[PDB]
């Protein structure tokens with residue numbers, strides 16, 4: 767509603783690494799693929815396997831664990847058979863995030879800016895966060911997703927504000943580059959990124975609205 771006397775009229779959040787931790791959801795996704803393929807389960811104690819799950823993308827993860835001829839095609843078939851709606855409850859909300867939204871609601875406009883395509887609206891519904899955000903920017907709602915400025919430029923047009931009247935909270939370089947190209951002050955969340963502000967806990971956002 768923007769009742770804040772400070773310069774910030776809206777706070778925009780990235781999803782993965784900022785609102786939620788999806789490691790347990792991504793791990794359960796590949797564990798189920800191993801079970802359907804009759805392969806041994808992945809181990810949390812295996813550093814290389816966990817490095818692959820943290821850094822590699824979906825296609826390259828399957829291409830890595832299934833190098834035997836014919837197995838990759840069956841692995842992609844198993845991945846597409848899994849209903850991701852069963853994996854959303856495995857996502858772990860970042861500590862103090864809902865409490866921070868409750869502190870912001872009515873004081874500033876609230877938005878989401880994610881590179882997710884279909885899942886974001888379902889994530890907000892299942893975690894009861896769909897009462898907070900007036901704009902939910904996804905990859906399916908822009909021609910050019912992050913690190914392009916388009917999604918953040920649509921957020922400024924949505925609230926009818928200037929770039930320096932908004933904050934974008936992100937944990938990745940693509941979040942920072944999108945904010946830089948849009949001219950929106952960036953807030954680094956638990957990340958080593960050059961930013962206007964940084965946060966180690968979500969409760970700090972109430973002090974960055976000046």
Ligand SMILES: [Mg+2]
Nearest residue numbers: 780782783937
């Ligand atoms: Mg992120």
